[PDB]
Structures are given as C-alpha cells and as structure tokens.
Tab-separated table of N, CA and C in Angstrom:
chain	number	residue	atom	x	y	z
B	1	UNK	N	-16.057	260.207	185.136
B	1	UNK	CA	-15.426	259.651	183.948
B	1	UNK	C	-16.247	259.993	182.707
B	2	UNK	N	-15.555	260.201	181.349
B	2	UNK	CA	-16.286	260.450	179.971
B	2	UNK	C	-15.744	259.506	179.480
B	3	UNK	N	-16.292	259.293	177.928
B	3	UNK	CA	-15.254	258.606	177.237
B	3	UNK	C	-15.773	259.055	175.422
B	4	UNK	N	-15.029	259.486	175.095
B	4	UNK	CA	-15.101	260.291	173.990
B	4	UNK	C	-14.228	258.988	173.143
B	5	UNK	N	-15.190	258.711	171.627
B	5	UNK	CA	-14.802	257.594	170.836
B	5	UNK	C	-15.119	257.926	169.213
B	6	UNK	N	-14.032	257.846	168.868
B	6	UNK	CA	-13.803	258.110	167.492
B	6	UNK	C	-13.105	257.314	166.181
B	7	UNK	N	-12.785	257.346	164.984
B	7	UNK	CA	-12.098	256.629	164.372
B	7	UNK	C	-11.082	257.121	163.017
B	8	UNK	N	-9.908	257.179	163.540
B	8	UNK	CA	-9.085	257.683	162.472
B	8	UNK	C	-8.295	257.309	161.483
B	9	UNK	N	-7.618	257.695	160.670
B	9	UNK	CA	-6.093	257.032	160.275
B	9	UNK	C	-4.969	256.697	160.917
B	10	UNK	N	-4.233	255.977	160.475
B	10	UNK	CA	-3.162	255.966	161.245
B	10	UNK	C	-2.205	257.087	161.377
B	11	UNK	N	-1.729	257.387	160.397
B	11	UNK	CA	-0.752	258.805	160.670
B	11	UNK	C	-1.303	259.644	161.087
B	12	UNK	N	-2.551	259.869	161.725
B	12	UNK	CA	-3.283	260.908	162.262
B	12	UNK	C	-3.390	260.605	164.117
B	13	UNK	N	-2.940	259.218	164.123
B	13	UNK	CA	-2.832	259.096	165.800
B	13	UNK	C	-1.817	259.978	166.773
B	14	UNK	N	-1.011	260.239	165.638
B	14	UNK	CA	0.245	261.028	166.588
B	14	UNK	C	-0.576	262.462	167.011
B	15	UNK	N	-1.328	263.158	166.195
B	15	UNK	CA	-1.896	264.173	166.577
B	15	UNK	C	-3.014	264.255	167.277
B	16	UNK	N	-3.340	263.267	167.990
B	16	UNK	CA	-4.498	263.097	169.120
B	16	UNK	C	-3.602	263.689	170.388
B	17	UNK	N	-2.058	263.298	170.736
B	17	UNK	CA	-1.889	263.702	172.008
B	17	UNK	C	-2.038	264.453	172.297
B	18	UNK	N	-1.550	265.294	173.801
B	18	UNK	CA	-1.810	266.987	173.684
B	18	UNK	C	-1.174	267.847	173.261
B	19	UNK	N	-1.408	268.853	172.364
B	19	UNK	CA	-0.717	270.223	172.303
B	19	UNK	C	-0.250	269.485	170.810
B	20	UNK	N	-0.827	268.989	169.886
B	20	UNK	CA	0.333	269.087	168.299
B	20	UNK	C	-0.666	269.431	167.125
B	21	UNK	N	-0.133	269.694	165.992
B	21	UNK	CA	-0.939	270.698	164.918
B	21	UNK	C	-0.981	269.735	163.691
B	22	UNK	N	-1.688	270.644	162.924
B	22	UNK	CA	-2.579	269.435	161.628
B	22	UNK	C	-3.769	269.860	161.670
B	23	UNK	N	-4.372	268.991	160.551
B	23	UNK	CA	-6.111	268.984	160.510
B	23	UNK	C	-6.351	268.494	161.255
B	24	UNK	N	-6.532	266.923	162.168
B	24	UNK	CA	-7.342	266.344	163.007
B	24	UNK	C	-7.273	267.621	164.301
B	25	UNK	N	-5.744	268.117	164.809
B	25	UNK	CA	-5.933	268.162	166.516
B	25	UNK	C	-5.835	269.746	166.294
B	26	UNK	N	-6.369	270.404	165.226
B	26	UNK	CA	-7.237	271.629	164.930
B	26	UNK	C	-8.330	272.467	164.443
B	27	UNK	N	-8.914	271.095	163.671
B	27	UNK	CA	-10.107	271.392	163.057
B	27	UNK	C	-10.900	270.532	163.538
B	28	UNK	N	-10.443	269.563	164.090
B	28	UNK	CA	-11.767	268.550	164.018
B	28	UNK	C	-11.770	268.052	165.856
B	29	UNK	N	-10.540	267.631	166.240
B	29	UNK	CA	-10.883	267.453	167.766
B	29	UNK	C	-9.370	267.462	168.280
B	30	UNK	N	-9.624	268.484	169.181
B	30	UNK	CA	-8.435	269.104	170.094
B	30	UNK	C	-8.379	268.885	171.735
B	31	UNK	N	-7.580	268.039	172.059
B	31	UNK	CA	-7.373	267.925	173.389
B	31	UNK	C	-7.173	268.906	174.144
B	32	UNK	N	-7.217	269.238	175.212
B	32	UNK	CA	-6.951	270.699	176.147
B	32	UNK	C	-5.338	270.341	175.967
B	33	UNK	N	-4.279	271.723	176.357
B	33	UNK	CA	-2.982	271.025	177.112
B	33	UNK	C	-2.931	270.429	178.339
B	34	UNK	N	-3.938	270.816	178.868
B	34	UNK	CA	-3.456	270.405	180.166
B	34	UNK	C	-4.727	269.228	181.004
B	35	UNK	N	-4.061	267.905	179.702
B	35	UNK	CA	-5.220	266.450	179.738
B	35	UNK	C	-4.784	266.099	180.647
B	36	UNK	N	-5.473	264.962	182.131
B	36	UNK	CA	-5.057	264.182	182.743
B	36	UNK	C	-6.092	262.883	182.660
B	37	UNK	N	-5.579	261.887	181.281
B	37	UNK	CA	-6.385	260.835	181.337
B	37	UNK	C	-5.818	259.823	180.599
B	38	UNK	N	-5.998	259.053	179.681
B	38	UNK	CA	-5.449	257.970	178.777
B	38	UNK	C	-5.787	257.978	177.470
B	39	UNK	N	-5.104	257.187	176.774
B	39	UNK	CA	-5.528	257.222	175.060
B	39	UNK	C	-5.186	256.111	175.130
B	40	UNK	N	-6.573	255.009	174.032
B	40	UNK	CA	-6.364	254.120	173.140
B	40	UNK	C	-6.385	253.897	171.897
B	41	UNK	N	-5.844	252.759	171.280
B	41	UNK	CA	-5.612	252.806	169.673
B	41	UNK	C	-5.137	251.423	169.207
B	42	UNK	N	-6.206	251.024	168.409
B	42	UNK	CA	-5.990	249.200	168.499
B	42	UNK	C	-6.520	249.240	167.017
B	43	UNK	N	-5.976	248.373	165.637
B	43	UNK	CA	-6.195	248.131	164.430
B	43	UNK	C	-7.470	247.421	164.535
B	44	UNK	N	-8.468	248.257	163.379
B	44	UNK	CA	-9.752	248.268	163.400
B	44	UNK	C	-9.916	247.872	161.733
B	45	UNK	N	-8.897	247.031	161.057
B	45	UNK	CA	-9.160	247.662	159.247
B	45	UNK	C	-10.043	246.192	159.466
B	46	UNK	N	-10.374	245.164	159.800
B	46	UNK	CA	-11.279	243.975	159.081
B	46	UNK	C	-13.099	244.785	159.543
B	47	UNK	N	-12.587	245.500	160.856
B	47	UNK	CA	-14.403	245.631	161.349
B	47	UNK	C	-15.008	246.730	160.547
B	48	UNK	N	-13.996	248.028	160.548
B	48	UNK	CA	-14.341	249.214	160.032
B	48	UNK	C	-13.746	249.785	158.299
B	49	UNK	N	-13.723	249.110	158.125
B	49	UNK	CA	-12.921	248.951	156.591
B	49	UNK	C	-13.756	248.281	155.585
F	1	UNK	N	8.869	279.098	174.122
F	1	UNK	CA	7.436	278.653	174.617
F	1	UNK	C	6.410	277.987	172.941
F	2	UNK	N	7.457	278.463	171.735
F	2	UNK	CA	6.985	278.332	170.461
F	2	UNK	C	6.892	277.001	169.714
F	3	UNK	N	8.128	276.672	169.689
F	3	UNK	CA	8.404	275.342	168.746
F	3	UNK	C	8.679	274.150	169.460
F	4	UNK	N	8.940	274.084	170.568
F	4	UNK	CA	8.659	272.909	171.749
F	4	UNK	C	7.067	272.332	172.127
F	5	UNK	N	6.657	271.124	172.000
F	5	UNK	CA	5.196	270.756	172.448
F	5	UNK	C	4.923	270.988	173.688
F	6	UNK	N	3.236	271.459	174.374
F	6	UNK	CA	3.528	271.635	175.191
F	6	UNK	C	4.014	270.681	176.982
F	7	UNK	N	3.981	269.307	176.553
F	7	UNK	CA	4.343	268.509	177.799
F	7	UNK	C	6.178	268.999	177.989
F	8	UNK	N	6.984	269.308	177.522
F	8	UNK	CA	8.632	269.241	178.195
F	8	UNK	C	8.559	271.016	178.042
F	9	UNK	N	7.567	272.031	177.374
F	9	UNK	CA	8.086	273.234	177.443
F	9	UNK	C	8.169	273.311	178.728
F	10	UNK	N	7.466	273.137	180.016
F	10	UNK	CA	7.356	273.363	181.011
F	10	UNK	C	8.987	272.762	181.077
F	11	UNK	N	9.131	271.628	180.733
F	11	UNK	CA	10.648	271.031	181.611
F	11	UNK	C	11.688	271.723	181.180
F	12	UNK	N	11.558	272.423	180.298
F	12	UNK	CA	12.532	273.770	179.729
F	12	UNK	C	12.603	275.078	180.389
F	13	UNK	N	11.132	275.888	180.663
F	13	UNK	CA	10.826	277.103	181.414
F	13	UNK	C	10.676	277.044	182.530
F	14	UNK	N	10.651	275.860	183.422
F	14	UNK	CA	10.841	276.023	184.648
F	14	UNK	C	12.521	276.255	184.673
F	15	UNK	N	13.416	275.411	184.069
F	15	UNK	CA	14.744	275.403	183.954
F	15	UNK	C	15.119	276.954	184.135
F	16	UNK	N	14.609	277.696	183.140
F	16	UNK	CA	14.860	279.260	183.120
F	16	UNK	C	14.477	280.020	184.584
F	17	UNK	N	13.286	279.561	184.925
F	17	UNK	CA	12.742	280.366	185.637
F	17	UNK	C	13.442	280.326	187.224
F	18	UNK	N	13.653	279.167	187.577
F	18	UNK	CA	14.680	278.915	188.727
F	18	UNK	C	16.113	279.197	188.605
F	19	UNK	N	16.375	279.152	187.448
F	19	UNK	CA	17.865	279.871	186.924
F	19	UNK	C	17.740	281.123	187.036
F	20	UNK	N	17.195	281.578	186.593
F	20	UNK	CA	16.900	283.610	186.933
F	20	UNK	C	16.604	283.907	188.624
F	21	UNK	N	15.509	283.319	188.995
F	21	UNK	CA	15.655	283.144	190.405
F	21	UNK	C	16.889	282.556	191.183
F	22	UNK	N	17.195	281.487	191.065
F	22	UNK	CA	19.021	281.722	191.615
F	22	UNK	C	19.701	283.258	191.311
F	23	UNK	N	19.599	283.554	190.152
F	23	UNK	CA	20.146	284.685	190.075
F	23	UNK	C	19.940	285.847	190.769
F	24	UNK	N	18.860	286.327	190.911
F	24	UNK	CA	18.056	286.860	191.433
F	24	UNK	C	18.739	287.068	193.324
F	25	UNK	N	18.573	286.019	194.176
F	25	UNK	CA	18.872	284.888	194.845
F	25	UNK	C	20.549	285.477	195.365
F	26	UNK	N	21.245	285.229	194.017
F	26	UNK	CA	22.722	285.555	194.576
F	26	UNK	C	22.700	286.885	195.088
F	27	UNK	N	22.152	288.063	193.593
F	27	UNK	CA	21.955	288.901	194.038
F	27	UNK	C	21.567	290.028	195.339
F	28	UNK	N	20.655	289.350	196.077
F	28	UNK	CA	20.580	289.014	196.906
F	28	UNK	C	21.401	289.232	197.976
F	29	UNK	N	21.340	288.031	198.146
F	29	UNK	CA	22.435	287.575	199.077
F	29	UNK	C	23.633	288.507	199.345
F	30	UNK	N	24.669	289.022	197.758
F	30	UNK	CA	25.388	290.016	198.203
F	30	UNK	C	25.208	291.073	198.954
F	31	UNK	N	23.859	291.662	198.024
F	31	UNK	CA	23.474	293.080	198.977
F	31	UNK	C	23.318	292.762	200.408
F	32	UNK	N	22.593	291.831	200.834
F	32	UNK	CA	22.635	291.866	202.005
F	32	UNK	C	23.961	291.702	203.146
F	33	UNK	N	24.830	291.331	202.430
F	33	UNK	CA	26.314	291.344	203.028
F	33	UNK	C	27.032	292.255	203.066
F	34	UNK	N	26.783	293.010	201.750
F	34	UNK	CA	27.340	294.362	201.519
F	34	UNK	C	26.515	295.498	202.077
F	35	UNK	N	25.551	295.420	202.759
F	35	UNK	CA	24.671	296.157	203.690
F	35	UNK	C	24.820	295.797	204.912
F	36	UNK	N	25.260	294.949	205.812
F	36	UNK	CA	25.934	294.632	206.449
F	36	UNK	C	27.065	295.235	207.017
F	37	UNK	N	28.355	295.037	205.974
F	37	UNK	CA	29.487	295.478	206.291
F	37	UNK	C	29.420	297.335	206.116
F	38	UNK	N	28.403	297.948	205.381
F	38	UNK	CA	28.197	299.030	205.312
F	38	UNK	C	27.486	299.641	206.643
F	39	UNK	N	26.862	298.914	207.296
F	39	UNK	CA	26.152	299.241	208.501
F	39	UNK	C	27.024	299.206	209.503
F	40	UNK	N	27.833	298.466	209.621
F	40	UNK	CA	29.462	298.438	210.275
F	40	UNK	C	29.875	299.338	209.903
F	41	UNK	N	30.344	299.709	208.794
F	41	UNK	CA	31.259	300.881	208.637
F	41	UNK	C	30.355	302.363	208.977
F	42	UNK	N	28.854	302.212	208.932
F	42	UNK	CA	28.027	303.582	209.056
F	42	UNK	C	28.131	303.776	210.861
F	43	UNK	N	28.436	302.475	211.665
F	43	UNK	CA	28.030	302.951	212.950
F	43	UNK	C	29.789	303.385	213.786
F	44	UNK	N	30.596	303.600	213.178
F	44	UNK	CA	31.924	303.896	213.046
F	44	UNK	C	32.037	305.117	212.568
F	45	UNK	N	31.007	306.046	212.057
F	45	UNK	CA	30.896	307.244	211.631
F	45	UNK	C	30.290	307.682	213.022
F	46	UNK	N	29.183	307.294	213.101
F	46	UNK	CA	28.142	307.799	214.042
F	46	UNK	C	29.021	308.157	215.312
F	47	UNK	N	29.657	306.869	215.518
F	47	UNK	CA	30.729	307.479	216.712
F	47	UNK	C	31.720	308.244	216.966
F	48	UNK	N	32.479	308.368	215.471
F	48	UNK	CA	33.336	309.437	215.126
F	48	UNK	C	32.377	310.493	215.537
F	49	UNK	N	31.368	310.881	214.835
F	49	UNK	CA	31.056	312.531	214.525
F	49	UNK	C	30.409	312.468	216.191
C-alpha cells in the first residue's frame, strides 16, 4: 500500500481521476490509466484556509 | 481511441474489435462450407477423369 496526499481546489477534483487533461492531471500530478485503487476528497476550507 | 476518456474507450473498442472478429468469423465459416461442397464437387471429377 502507498498513500500519496495532497491539497487542491475544488474544480480541480474532477481531474485527479484517470486519464483527463488540464493543469493539475498534466503538469503537476498524473495518475497512470491503468489505476487500481481509491480516491478521497472531504472539505478542508476551516483547517486549510 | 481520441476524444473518449480512457475507462469506457475500452467499452467502445472492444465493441469494434469482436464485431470485426464476428466478421472475420462469418467469413470464415462460409469458406469453409464452400470448400467443402467444392471438395465434393472436386472428388466427382477425379472419378470422372
């Protein structure tokens, strides 16, 4: 198991899944296509804000 | 393989790819019937001549 942890925008979550385009899931962090694992994503604006 | 993401291209190009193979498949299948009835009709020579 890994666990790779990061923190984004919101309209930028759609481009974490696999295989979609933009700045985040091409310049900055790109999933393989062919992921077999999970994604989370839970509102962070009082801790990290 | 272009403008589709890649999780359903697969559920698209397999679609093709077993569709051409059926095709493929029928193809097939005739010749071997029509090689058949030709092998019938070739051993109907053999006995003529």
């Amino acid at each position: 198991v890994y666990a790779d942890s990061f923190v984004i925008r919101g309209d930028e979550v759609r481009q974490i899944a696999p295989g979609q385009t933009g700045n985040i899931a091409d310049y900055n962090y790109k999933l393989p296509d062919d992921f077999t694992g999970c994604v989370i994503a839970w509102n962070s604006n009082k801790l990290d804000s | 393989f272009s403008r589709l993401d890649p999780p359903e291209a697969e559920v698209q190009i397999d679609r093709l790819i077993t569709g051409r193979l059926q095709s493929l498949q029928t193809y097939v299948t005739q010749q071997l019937i029509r090689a058949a009835e030709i092998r019938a009709s070739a051993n109907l020579a053999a006995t003529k001549m």
